[PDB]
Amino acid sequence: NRIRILIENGVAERQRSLFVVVGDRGKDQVVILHHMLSKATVKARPSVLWCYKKELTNIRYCYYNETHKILGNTFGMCVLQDFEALTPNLLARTVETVEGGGLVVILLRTMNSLKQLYTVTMDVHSRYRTEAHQDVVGRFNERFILSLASCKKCLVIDDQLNILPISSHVGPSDLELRELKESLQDTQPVGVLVDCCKTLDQAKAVLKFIEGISEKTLRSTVALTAARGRGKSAALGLAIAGAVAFGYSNIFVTSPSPDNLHTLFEFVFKGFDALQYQEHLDYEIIQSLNPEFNKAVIRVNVFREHRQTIQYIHPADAVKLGQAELVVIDEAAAIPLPLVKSLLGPYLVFMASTINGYEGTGRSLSLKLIQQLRARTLYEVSLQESIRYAPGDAVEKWLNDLLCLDCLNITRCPLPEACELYYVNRDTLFCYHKASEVFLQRLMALYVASHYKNSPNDLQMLSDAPAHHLFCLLPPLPEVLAVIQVCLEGEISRQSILNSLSRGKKASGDLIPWTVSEQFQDPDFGGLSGGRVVRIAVHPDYQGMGYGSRALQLLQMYYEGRFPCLEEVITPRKDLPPLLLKLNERPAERLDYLGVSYGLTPRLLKFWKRAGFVPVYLRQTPNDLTGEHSCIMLKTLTGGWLAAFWKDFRRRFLALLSYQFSTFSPSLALNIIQNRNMGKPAQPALSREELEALFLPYDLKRLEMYSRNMVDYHLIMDMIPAISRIYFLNQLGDLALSAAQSALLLGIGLQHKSVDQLEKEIELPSGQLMGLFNRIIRKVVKLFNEVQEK
Amino acid sequence: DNRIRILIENGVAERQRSLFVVVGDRGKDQVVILHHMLSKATVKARPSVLWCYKKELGATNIRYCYYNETHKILGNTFGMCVLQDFEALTPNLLARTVETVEGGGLVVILLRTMNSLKQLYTVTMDVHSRYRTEAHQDVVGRFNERFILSLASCKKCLVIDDQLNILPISSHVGPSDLELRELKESLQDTQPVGVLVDCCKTLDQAKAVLKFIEGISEKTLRSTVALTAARGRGKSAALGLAIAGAVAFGYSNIFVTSPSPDNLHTLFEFVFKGFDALQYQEHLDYEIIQSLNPEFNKAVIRVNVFREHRQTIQYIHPADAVKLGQAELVVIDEAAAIPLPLVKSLLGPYLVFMASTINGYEGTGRSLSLKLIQQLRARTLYEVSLQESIRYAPGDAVEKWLNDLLCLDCLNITRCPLPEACELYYVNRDTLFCYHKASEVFLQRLMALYVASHYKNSPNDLQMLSDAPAHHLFCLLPPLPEVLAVIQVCLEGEISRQSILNSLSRGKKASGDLIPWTVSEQFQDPDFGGLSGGRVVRIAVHPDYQGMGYGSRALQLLQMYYEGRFPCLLLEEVITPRKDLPPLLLKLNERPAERLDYLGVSYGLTPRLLKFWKRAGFVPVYLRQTPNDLTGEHSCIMLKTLTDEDGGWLAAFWKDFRRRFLALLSYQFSTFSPSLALNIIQNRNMGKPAQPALSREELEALFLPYDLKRLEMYSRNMVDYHLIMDMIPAISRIYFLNQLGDLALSAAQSALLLGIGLQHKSVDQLEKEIELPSGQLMGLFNRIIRKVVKLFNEVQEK
């Protein structure tokens, strides 16, 4: 009979409920629950939502693949079917769209026992199938089932409304908000926009934004932080509408894609309606009418007293922000820092960010760490109350704990040489239990506090992957200094790889083996044993102390071989080995090489190269967002094939520096070009045979003539790309060229950069640049004369 | 003595400038007598004298500039100008120092101390040290003779000696401010439309003022207005008042377009004047922002006005059009002096104010193409113009004399024969610049064709036309009724062998002989300077007679003429015009040729001009890497060998230029269109000595065996082209070097290979240049890969 009490409690406290129904029918329980919810609620039709994977009272039928379109909607309850289709990211997107007093219902199957641990038939499990490791053990399902007995609103029933023993163990906010609205009722476009707010926290950033807009000063960059469902686009839209009514003419909205917000402009129209604006003769909107989002509004024109416009602009587009009066930045945390700095200027800035949910990051965010330096204004506001349910919802806490979307960590010197590396048993890490879930939360806390976004699908990757291993660094459960996730790759095939080099298939894993072999046409690379470092992360409080390098070094020797191995519910688990195992008690796989795929970064490039990695691949097309190119590095473990791959990559990079790598800084390109792990077997010089074939005798005369009556460099600009090409190929001896001279030669020759363009990058005067360039010419001319036997 | 008084009195009573020429060593001391007479005649005290000096010579308010700071006085208005140091006096500052004189002026030129009016054969021009070619070192100076002879054609050009005595040469010699006043009275009580009109000085100025503001008053963002000036009627003042009116009308986004901030120097001055008429207080209602840079001087860039909302007026470059997304009003100054593609990109869905100059030393004829496409249409084409001067009454004799002397008139336009029946004649420069009758009209017609073919066209070319020692005139006549085409050719070459070596060892060139010096410096060939050549300085055809090959026939006839296919089978005296000269037009059979060895031309690169010059038979030899200021064009030098009058050296120069162009296509020529670069690469006037195939040694040395395997794999699979993007620049380089055979590549395929390889252009960037979809571009690119792969297979013994 406890079903009724749970329904009444949820509807009387604005708290969602969670029901898990086990049964083949799945039709005699949804209607009963729907009737109970209708009786318990004031309304009649809660507009329930039903979702499927690919196939099967205002009910709309949605599909799992097409989910981003439903992010902005609100329903009374959620129904989930076809359990072997969900993903951790998907589970956090459908439950967040349920109003207070929800009736979220999940129908797994018609089991009669614990047939969920080994019944993993997820679509995502087909992409973990590696030919080397075809055995996959479901582990996420075990944690999901065991998490239903830790919350007070997670009742589990069957198709016959029978309570299982597992689940058998189990207003005030709207007080100051209405008072504030009444106080600001008489206020001219100040309180009317506040009336459109739904939460007291929402009508505090809006008031702050309105107060900043009211003061006609262009020095304010107040930033707002959200928590994925507490209201951030609505506050921004009301602020933009208030700015329009305040006489602002230049208002810009910054977002990576038009599809991101989809709500900011909706509330702008709502705010305009609160201002008694008719959007047919006082203002007009312009839609994309192009393959950008679906029907996102790009430009809005308002003509009441003067002409004002609201235009969507790209985060990288800052040229059109000259006469801008107000700029709105959405998800500035995920926006690259250099883009943020360029966007900011002497005008009003409205910043929005998320530090919770399945987005954003924390760990002393650099957003409010460097901007807190000044005439500039640094107001800050935040939200902590949801707009769809009462704070402290059991379902939200259950989702956050299961999905590890919490525990910002931060709360915590030892010498790096005294640290020890310990292997983590994934079998005992995802079995809930006690003192192990906290370790999992701490590990995931380090996971998400290192990089923006960090989609929760990695949690399933962390548990259900067949060839993934976890290593942690511990001081001499103690605090985890660093965590490393390594994926085993290689030992695939030779005949299938040969067919895969043709118009074949790239399987579903082994990114490094399927990329290096494809790019270098070497079928023998896939037969080697390798390990890919998928994720590495040190604690934010001890970055730069050497813990990451020591952890990488310890992993290298462990893989080399320097650590010889000398009804009727049930309890979660009692067996399984301890959580942490010493490196001396676990045999190694005897890997032949170590690889890593990451996004190119001058600081990351230095760290990886110092570890002993050699670049092997660099993607030409920039990756979407963050403006970075994918880079693949390899390191031999003990050479033959690495040297050949390194030489081939260096030759390709020289010619590819003119297509898409021209935007690279000369220092970054020079660092990629030169490595200390690989030697230079190019001792033989250019010789007179190649010098005459490559350069005409008149061309050599012009180069020699330039070195004695030094004149404008445009006469010999046709020879610079050839000279740079044959110098970086180690065919021009040594020439004792300095770092500045080498960078200048690379930029002018390979990148075809002008001297004025290189002025900012090199940060040297034009006279010094002329002298360095002229000195290179004399050195090349002198060496050429020596080659030609005087 | 007396006649000076009436002339001064008549000039001050009619708002017409005067002109006095004083001759004698006692000059510069009798100016006070004229100054005293002017002060009594006029109703002012200080006429703001404008004394000038050559470069260092030395209750009255002179402004002391000599010749360099002429742009500093370009905006100020004076009441009397004193011109000294006749030595330099190039025909470009005379139009700048007299136009800045108010009505009833006393423009005085002190000339020199000639005791018998020595005329042209004395007092050499201090510009003559710019045409002293080492081959031709004999200048005449016909400009001085023409200037002296033109002093007896106007009624207010009296010439006096050092003793205030009229020379025998010169001894032979209101209603406008009515409608403007009533217009101001009718608009006295009007809102800012009516108060800004009172700031105008002429009725013509306050007729375009009530066209910009009228368009401003109507809140419609689809309208453009074109205004034409004549260098002294007032155009920036009207633009400034219109901008000020727009600011008072609630406009928030106003942009001003000009090549340089110093071009106007008065638009913002009248904007502040209009703001003062609007009762706007500085530092309380608006603020200004300066450039604070050595270049562009201390002009005004951005002006911010905060009365009710925030409005700004920002100067923008013609190239910069991205920032015009939210523009409401855009003002384009000197639109006729801006490239057409830049003007079209600047225009958009807002209010456009177009300003241009037709007469004076700014803007020329045949510029109606700007006001010929905008008339296609939702958008309007309101037309305004000015015809009355600011400082002096219209119809001034001094203005007419200056215009006639500098040929700043005769807009031409007023005028079928087959080109094959046309005849080419030579023009004697001695009898062309001697004034006379029926010859000055020909000079005006020739200058009419000269100006109406190219913008700017500074009058200094007239001195180069006459005073140059090695310049010749050629015209095409129908079978002097009318000049179908005119050609100006400069002779160059025969400099030295050791002088070139000394110049090459230092790198300084010299004055004159642009083509011989550039080719020698760029190719290190001292033997080129000893050859005989002729540089086509300018070729012009009638605008109504362009398109039927009149220029081509004139160029062809000139070629055979040079080849040798036309065998020769204080005065106390009256100067009077000289008539002892040969006929004005001489047949080509009565003038011996110079027997030149080659024909050259230096011009700015243009796809239509490139096709025309290449069709004539010219071969590119040089192309300037950096873009020239304005018009976005690169200087190009073409050469053509003269058969039967001299080709070995040209072939070597052409091969060297082609090799350099391939490597230079990635530095500054990457912005060139693929069609334009391909046209420059391939020429029909020179045969192609392509080497048959390439040896296997070169293939292995340039391409690694694994690289060839990757290329073969791509051709068999058509997978991703990014895998072989490192080989495309090398493949393109060897294909255009005549080392890849023929390959039967089409024009589209060749353009695609050039853009991707040599120019390093992405496929998406080439979508709008080839006008072919990316799907077809992939097929063409893939087909080239198969052809290259197949050819490489045969190279390595199948």
Ligand SMILES: CC(C)(COP(=O)(O)OP(=O)(O)OC[C@H]1O[C@@H](n2cnc3c(N)ncnc32)[C@H](O)[C@@H]1OP(=O)(O)O)[C@@H](O)C(=O)NCCC(=O)NCCS
């Ligand atoms: C990358 C990371 C594991 C390095 O850990 P670490 O213990 O600080 O490394 P070290 O102590 O050896 O520091 C030495 C070098 O690391 C580099 N580096 C250091 N901290 C970095 C940071 N937050 N971000 C990027 N690179 C960093 C630096 O270039 C440094 O060289 P330097 O002293 O000349 O400046 C960690 O700091 C980090 O930033 N993780 C998030 C980004 C990431 O995971 N990249 C890997 C992608 S697979």
Ligand SMILES: CC(C)(COP(=O)(O)OP(=O)(O)OC[C@H]1O[C@@H](n2cnc3c(N)ncnc32)[C@H](O)[C@@H]1OP(=O)(O)O)[C@@H](O)C(=O)NCCC(=O)NCCS
């Ligand atoms: C001579 C000139 C007028 C064009 O030659 P033309 O005798 O009128 O016409 P032609 O039949 O000989 O062919 C010339 C080609 O250039 C084109 N062209 C035509 N008018 C032109 C013009 N004002 N300016 C530039 N190119 C022009 C023509 O269309 C023609 O191309 P087409 O074969 O596709 O029709 C052109 O060279 C010119 O002089 N323009 C004025 C600017 C100038 O001084 N140019 C010379 C630079 S030194």
